[PDB]
Symmetry: C3
Subunit: 90 residues, 3 copies
Amino acid sequence: SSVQTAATSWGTVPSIRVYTANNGKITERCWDGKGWYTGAFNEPGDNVSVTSWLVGSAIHIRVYASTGTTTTEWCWDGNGWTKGAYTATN
Amino acid sequence: SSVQTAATSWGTVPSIRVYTANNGKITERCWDGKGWYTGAFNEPGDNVSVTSWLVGSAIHIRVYASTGTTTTEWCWDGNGWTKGAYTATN
Amino acid sequence: SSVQTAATSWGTVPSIRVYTANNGKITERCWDGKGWYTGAFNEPGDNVSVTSWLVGSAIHIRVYASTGTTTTEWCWDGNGWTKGAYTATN
Ligand SMILES: OC[C@@]1(O)OC[C@@H](O)[C@@H](O)[C@@H]1O
Ligand SMILES: OC[C@@]1(O)OC[C@@H](O)[C@@H](O)[C@@H]1O
Ligand SMILES: OC[C@@]1(O)OC[C@@H](O)[C@@H](O)[C@@H]1O
């Protein structure tokens, strides 16, 4: 068994976020051009995917964390992570 | 065992598509700014990845669905899903 | 058990890169508008994710290859793949 990752990036420098699912926990490593550091995202999950988009200079991130058949969406919109409206009927 | 997801997004609103592989079947949930709904994509696969690109206002999506060592590419180019030219020698 | 893929794309044609983890090995298939071909990326790993960004017309790619709890970052910046600075404490 190996960890499972998901990655997103924005800008030209760039900024990168790498999410790793490891033993049921998803953590985040961050690059903003001057070294990797540990991000504020730490949530349960066995599987992770991510997407992001810019609006001007403002980044928006969506992380999809799944355990069993339940997927939880986590949202970054400039001022902290929040749970999103995503639902699915798996 | 957990489901496995892949996500893409475009624009600023934005639009988001989340693909979930669950028990050998890949389905699609969609956001266009006003609620999540079930998309037209429903194909067999144990693993999924996705990428997309805009040409002006027109979205193009590629979904890579894998079962065993066989990966099938599915294409959205504005008027329905079609099988793509992707091949690999896995 | 199925192979596991990750995909990225850039431009409008577009260019696409699809990475496949298969039996501990990650390989790359490439589209630049006129057929799929095998890319120069061939590295060990049981899991793969990818992100990319344009700077003008220059593509930059980051591939995250994981075996066990160890993730290795591979970088394309226009002139060959190189190992990146990414670390994590998994
Ligand atoms: O500046 C770092 C940070 O705020 O960037 C946005 C998100 O990736 C956060 O989890 C992360 O801590
Ligand atoms: O408007 C929704 C839709 O047409 O958007 C493009 C694709 O994601 C389709 O599967 C989906 O049904
Ligand atoms: O032109 C093809 C190529 O150079 O494109 C950039 C990377 O995807 C490489 O592995 C690949 O061989």
